[PDB]
A paper describes a structure:
Methylenetetrahydrofolate dehydrogenase/cyclohydrolase 2 ([name]) is a bifunctional metabolic enzyme found in mitochondria, exhibiting both dehydrogenase and cyclohydrolase catalytic activities. In one-carbon metabolism, [name] converts 5, 10-methylene tetrahydrofolate (5,10-CH2-THF) to 10-formyl tetrahydrofolate (10-CHO-THF) in mitochondria, thereby regulating the production of NADH, purines, and pyrimidines. An isozyme, methylenetetrahydrofolate dehydrogenase, cyclohydrolase and formyltetrahydrofolate synthetase 1 (MTHFD1), performs similar catalytic reactions to [name], albeit localized in the cytoplasm rather than the mitochondrion. The key distinction between these two proteins lie in their expression profiles: MTHFD1 is typically expressed in normal cells while [name] is abundantly expressed in immortal, embryonic, and cancer cells, but absent in adult normal cells.
Bioisosteric replacement of γ-carboxylic acid of glutamic acid with 1H-tetrazole to give 16a significantly increased the potency against MTHFD1 (IC50 = 120 nM) and [name] (IC50 = 22 nM). The structure of [name]/16a revealed the headgroup, 2,5,6-triamino-3H-pyrimidin-4-one ring of 16a, establishes a hydrogen bond network with key amino acid residues, including Val131, Leu133, and Asp155. The urea moiety of 16a formed hydrogen bonds with the side chain of Lys88 and Gln132. In the middle region of 16a, the phenyl ring formed robust π–π interactions with Tyr84, and hydrophobic interactions with neighboring amino acids such as Tyr84, Ile276, Thr316, and Val317. The amide moiety adjacent to the phenyl ring was hydrogen bonded with Asn87 and participated in hydrophobic interactions with Gly313. Furthermore, the carboxylic acid moiety of 16a not only formed a hydrogen bond with the main chain of Gly310 but also established a well-organized hydrogen bond network with Gly311, Val312, and Gly313 mediated by a water molecule. Moreover, the 1H-tetrazole moiety formed hydrogen bonds with the side chain of Ser83. Superimposition of the structures of [name]/16a with [name]/LY374571 revealed that the 1H-tetrazole moiety in 16a exhibits an enhanced tendency for forming hydrogen bonds, either directly or through water bridging, with the side chain of Arg278 and Ser83. Moreover, the larger size of 1H-tetrazole moiety was found to form more extensive van der Waals contacts with neighboring residues such as Ile276, Leu289, and Pro309, as compared to its γ-carboxylic acid counterpart. The collective impact of these interactions contributes to the increased potency of 16a and 16g against [name].
Numbering used by the authors:
A (entry chain A): 36 to 280, 286 to 332
B (entry chain B): 36 to 280, 288 to 332
The structure:
């Protein structure tokens, strides 16, 4: 039976490290770090996630505010707010929760965050630098997926990894970290990485996952991954968070079935989710210090 | 037996499209495109490739100058030259031929070229836009590999593709173009892409290539791809240019000629496509589409 990695427990520990680093940063006489999250509209999952981000900020001693705006806001109005916060010396970290309404262009919003306050890693310069293996602010969820693999001791070099999903904020950066060179400014995992997505036929996904030592599913599809596609002893990291039915929450992985064939497994909830919040706190203290 | 895709004949068409577009662009009153190439030192393959580049520019109506500097040049002096060209209103496309001598930070040189003149697609903003599937200058060898696949009509959507190599300038953008979404600003190939590299064991490479509808080799290793790794009928695209003793790619051409459906020769395969797509990017830059 597979070891269930608690993302809740790993995240909680990482927050402690961030907390220690913050009180030391403050005791050295620097300003306490402040994080500003802009929330647009009323997606319920967005409000949970932002709520968890602001709770972790309190836990790690970072000041925070959530600024909620209605979905009917215009792109100029959001840009004005972002520019205002870009210019508030008290604001070290600034993120806009995604997704945004169809009339707001995400990339223009993401690029409008001052790159030094870009705790999301979503600004195009930050994406370029990550894709060139330079020093960069890493996006939280992919960096959380990496920390689960690293802090658990699961090896990546020369190993087979399948990522199901290619979103620019989740699947693509995960795939970029795991396959890239360990020797570069920002090291990578030196793994052999298969990117699959909505046009991968389910029979072809199986033909690759069977080869895999790590399967990372970020597709948003319940039971996408099941025990017959999983090689024995392999690590399965479930990035999906899907609302199904009374209302429940699952990942992409058939947790119970894969449990019996994986060597490692991530639950949903309490897996990759809490790790995203933790790495965001790390990015905020990194941004407050002005290291990049 | 395996169709041998002619790199020279496809680039001929692409180049004719460009001469057409440049002539229309000039006739309607605009300035003729100008491409500046900076070349450092005396790598004989570099001078060959630059010469091929300016030869192709001349036949498609694009003016061009090669600027040669010695290997002993200093990074500060190259930065001067690049900044002067960024501000020369005649220069539409500017590119610095790689590799650069070991004492020069290639990344810092690439980011020095202004992105609107970055016909290589190597400035960090162009790398990021490409990785976001946005309108960008695509790098010439990656775009050439794509054009070979599209214009030969080899399907990619839903197909297994392996790329051997992860270099930021060739292997990585090939993998990016091929796995990405056909419906985005810059479309991709919607394939299932495996990225292999130097720490991939051969057994695991072969276990992934026997599944591959398209194998793309950009590793710079002679005889890497052999017929036992290739499934019957699959397309094999040889990006590597290896000076063995002669000039050959990564593939075992004669052997894989028997198992593959399609194959590309070295030379005369991807090589000419790189020169062809650089011509596309130069007319794109002159139009200031971005
Ligand atoms: N911290 C966390 O755990 C966290 C945070 C955010 C999102 N998520 C989840 O992780 C994923 C992130 O992706 P997103 O929501 O940004 O992307 P998205 O919703 O825009 O697209 C999802 C991706 O799934 C892929 N996909 C769809 N069907 C597939 C199939 N049959 N096989 C393989 N791939 C398939 C798509 O091609 C696409 O790349 C989603 O599943 C989301 O629920 C998790
Ligand atoms: N330099 C040029 O002008 C030019 C032009 C077109 C094509 N190419 C070819 O493309 C290659 C890549 O371009 P570059 O020079 O920027 O890259 P590079 O020389 O930095 O490295 C090439 C790649 O090969 C990979 N590799 C090494 N051993 C491997 C193995 N056993 N299996 C799979 N992959 C392996 C490496 O991990 C690396 O990513 C070149 O070596 C060259 O032959 C070069
Ligand atoms: N700008 C921007 N926009 C974005 N969208 C993201 N991504 C993001 O925020 N992801 C995210 C996902 C899950 C969770 C979390 O807290 N997970 C808990 C369950 C809690 C719960 N509450 N209700 N249901 N579940 C769990 O998985 O156990 C926190 C954050 C970003 O990073 N930056
Ligand atoms: N900034 C920058 N720097 C770079 N280094 C590159 N890469 C690059 O230019 N690659 C490249 C490789 C081959 C050829 C070519 O012409 N191949 C022919 C001739 C064979 C031959 N050789 N000698 N005799 N015959 C063939 O393969 O058929 C053209 C370009 C770049 O794109 N931008």
């Amino acid at each position: 039976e597979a070891v269930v990695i608690s993302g809740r427990k790993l995240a909680q520990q990482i927050k402690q490290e961030v907390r220690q680093e913050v009180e030391e940063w403050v005791a050295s006489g620097n300003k306490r770090p402040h994080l500003s999250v802009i929330l647009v509209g009323e997606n319920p999952a967005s409000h949970s996630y932002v709520l968890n981000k602001t709770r972790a900020a309190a836990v790690v001693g970072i000041n925070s505010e959530t600024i909620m705006k209605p979905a009917s806001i215009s792109e100029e109005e959001l840009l004005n707010l972002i520019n205002k916060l870009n210019n508030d010396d008290n604001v070290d970290g600034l993120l806009v929760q995604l997704p945004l309404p169809e009339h707001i262009d995400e990339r223009r919003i993401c690029n409008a965050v001052s790159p030094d306050k870009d705790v999301d890693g979503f600004h195009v310069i930050n994406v370029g630098r990550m894709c060139l293996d330079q020093y960069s602010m890493l996006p939280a969820t992919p960096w959380g997926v990496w920390e689960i693999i690293k802090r658990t001791g699961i090896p990546t070099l020369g190993k087979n990894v399948v990522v199901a999903g290619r979103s620019k904020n989740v699947g693509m950066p995960i795939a970029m970290l795991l396959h890239t060179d360990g020797a570069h400014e920002r090291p990578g995992g030196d793994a052999t990485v298969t990117i699959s997505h909505r046009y991968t036929p389910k029979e072809q996904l199986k033909k690759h996952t069977i080869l895999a030592d790590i399967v990372i599913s970020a597709a948003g599809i319940p039971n996408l991954i099941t025990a017959d596609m999983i090689k024995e002893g392999a690590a399965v990291i479930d990035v999906g968070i899907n609302r199904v039915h009374k209302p429940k929450l699952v990942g992409d992985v058939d947790f119970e079935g894969v449990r019996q064939k994986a060597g490692y497994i991530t639950p949903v909830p309490g897996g990759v989710g809490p790790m995203t919040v933790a790495m965001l706190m790390k990015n905020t203290i990194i941004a407050a210090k002005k290291v990049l």
